[PDB]
Amino acid sequence: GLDSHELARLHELARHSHAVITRHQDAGGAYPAAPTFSAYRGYAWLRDGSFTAEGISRYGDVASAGRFHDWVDGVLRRRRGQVDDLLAAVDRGEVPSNEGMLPTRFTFDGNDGSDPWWDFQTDGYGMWLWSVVTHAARHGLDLERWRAGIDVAVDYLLAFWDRPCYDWWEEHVEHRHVSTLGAIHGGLVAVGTCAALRSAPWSAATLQVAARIRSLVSAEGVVDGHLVKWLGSSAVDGSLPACVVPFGLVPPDDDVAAMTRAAVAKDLDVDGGVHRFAADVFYGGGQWILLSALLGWNLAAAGDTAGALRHLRWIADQADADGDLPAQVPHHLLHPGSRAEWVARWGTVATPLLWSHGMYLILADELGLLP
Ligand SMILES: OC[C@H]1O[C@@H](O)[C@H](O)[C@@H](O)[C@@H]1O
């Protein structure tokens, strides 16, 4: 579905995506989120990093992806005691506050980069489980390399999956977000269906909890045939297609999958650029590369190759003169009056965003375009 002009440009953007991710990877293995964006400099997120790692793994850079997994594993093994203490607190009937939970931002040396009172999130731990299992399966690797870190993440998620937390967008701590539940589900199903992990003590529990997640989403996370942004809402969010591919709450051909893709397209997709959610005021609520990629990936998986390609083309059109992809662009803004204050406070939008490049690589690979 691409002519020679397009193929050459998409291949170049794929090469550049690999280069900019691997050039910015820290010496210790972490992928930074946004190396030139002042507010985020020096920090890694498991969400951004896991999708970045999946793009890199698909591209075939086994060494780079493995160094990311090494970094995450080591960071998590260092939290074995913190997690054990949280679990012991629960067993005494003393549920830990958000302030005591595992962090969202990490420094490259594995310390808390932010205070979880202000940004407590569980999705990234689920994403990491999905990512490391998927990588190991793809490349025929022994998961024992990363198993003790996997164990920490699994124990944590089995205890805390059903807690309210901030969403992927670091908002609304009181709610339970369907793409957060979806990320956890994806990670738990990945480990619970992995033959190499068949004897883990938590093996059965992971699939039972994944079923509990699906029960909760069925009860409170579906309205008018589509997934919704958080349990008990009516709105959609551009992250919701992740609950189809890759996280697997429903197959790509399920009616809920189709309806969710359609609702996201109708409510949030403007000319191929997907907004996060209707109420979004961050930088005025622009169009996010990673969300267009996510929708494209989902369209490809459902057999809508043309729709996938349209989103791939839109993403490529957002690359700057160096090939770098921003987090978002302002061609359409949901709340334009809100934009200038974000720019005054934090500067211009993060570019490159490694996750943008990682998602580009995933979609390109889905469409058979990795050179
Ligand atoms: O890139 C780091 C973080 O930036 C935030 O603005 C986004 O809402 C998160 O989804 C992302 O993980």
> Which overall shape is indicated by the principal axes computed on the Cα atoms?
globular
Distance between the termini: 16 Å
Strand percentage lies at under 5%
**Rg:** 19 Å
Helical proportion, percent range? 40-55%
Overall strand count: 8
Largest sheet: 2 strands, antiparallel
Q: How many individual helices?
A: 14
Helix-strand pattern: HEHHHEHHHHHEEHEEEHHEHH
Compounds present?
beta-D-glucopyranose
Enumerate the strands of the largest sheet in spatial order, edge to edge or round the barrel.
1-2
The chain-level structural class is mainly alpha
Main location: cytoplasm
Binding site for substrate: 117
EC number: 3.2.1.205
Enzyme class: hydrolase
Description of the structure:
- Pfam families: Glyco_hydro_15 (PF00723).
- Substrate binds at residue 117.
- With 371 residues, the protein is mainly α.
- The chain has one domain.
- The protein has 14 helices and eight strands.
- It has helices spanning 4-24, 46-59, 62-77, 80-91, 116-119, 123-139, 147-160, 178-192, 203-220, 255-268, 289-301, 305-316, 339-346, 354-366, and strands at 43-44, 106-107, 222-223, 226-227, 269-270, 273-274, 287-288, 328-329.
- The strands form four sheets. The chain has a two-stranded antiparallel ribbon with strand order 1-2. It has a two-stranded antiparallel sheet with strand order 3-4. A two-stranded antiparallel sheet has the order 5-6.
- Helix 2 (46-59) packs antiparallel against helix 3 and helix 6 runs parallel beside helix 8.
- The longest helix has 21 residues, at 4-24.
- The chain is globular.
- It starts with a helix and ends in a 5-residue tail after the last helix.
- The structure holds beta-D-glucopyranose (BGC).
- The site of beta-D-glucopyranose has 11 residues, from helix 2.
